[PDB]
Amino acid sequence: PLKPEEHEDILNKLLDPELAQSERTEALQQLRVNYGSFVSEYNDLTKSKMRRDLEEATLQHEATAAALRKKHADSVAELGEQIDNLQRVKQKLEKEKSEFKLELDDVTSNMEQIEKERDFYFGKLRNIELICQENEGENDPVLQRIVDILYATDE
C-alpha cells in the first residue's frame, strides 16, 4: 500500500505540466492500481463487515482441516486393518507350518521303524531260503512247501 509519503511524491510529480507523457501516464497508473485493489475495498469496510469476514475464514479453515483429518484417519485405519489381517494370517500359517512340521516325523520315524521291521523279516526269509538251497537236493517235500512260500508273490 502506498505510504502517505509515496503518494505525495506522485501528486507533486503530476503537478508539473511539463513532465513527460510516459511518466505522467505511468504515475497515474500507480495510483490507479493502488486505488484499484485496496483503496476501493476500504470505501465500505465496517469493523463489523470484516469481523464476519475474519470469522468466516476461521470457519472455512477449520472445516478444511477437519475434512483433511477425516481423510487421513480413514487411510490410517485401512492400513491398520490390513496389518491386523496379515497378522491373523501369520499366526495361522506358522501354526500349520509347525503342525505339519513334526506330524511329518511322527509319521516318518514311525516309518523308519516299520522299515527295519520289514528288513528284519526280509532277512529272516533270506536266511531260511539259504538253508533251503543248502538242502535242495533232498527233494524234501516239506522243504519244497517252504521254498514255494518264499518265492510266492503278491508283494
Added chain:
Amino acid sequence: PLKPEEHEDILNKLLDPELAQSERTEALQQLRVNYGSFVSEYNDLTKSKMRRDLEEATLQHEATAAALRKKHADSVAELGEQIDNLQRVKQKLEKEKSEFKLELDDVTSNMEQIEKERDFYFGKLRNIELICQENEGENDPVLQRIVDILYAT
C-alpha cells in the same frame, strides 16, 4: 469520499497536460485529502488488528495443514513397510507350510507300501512257522535251523 470512479474521472483530467494549473492543483488537492481520510481509516486499530489477525490465521492454518500432511505421509510409509513385510513373511510361511505338507503326502504313501511289504513278509514267516510245528514230530536238524531263525532276536 470518492466513488471508485469519481476517482477515475480525475486520473484522466490529469492525463492531459494542457489542463490549467489552477484546476490541476484542485484535482490533486482533492486526491490528497481523500487519501488522508483513507489512510487514517486503514490505520484504525480495530481494522489493523483484524488485518493482521486474518493474515496470521491463514499462516498458522497453512503451517498446520503442512504438519498434518507430513505426519500423514510418514505414517503411511511406516505402515507401508509393515504391510509389505507381513506379506513377504506370509509368502514365506505359505511355502514352508505346504512343503512340509507335500513331504508328508509322499512319505505317508511311501510307507503304506513298506508296511505292505512287512506284512507280506511276516505272513510268509507265519506260514513257515505253521509248517515247522506240523513237522516237529520227526525233528529234522534242518527244520531246527529254520525255527532257530524264526525266533532269533
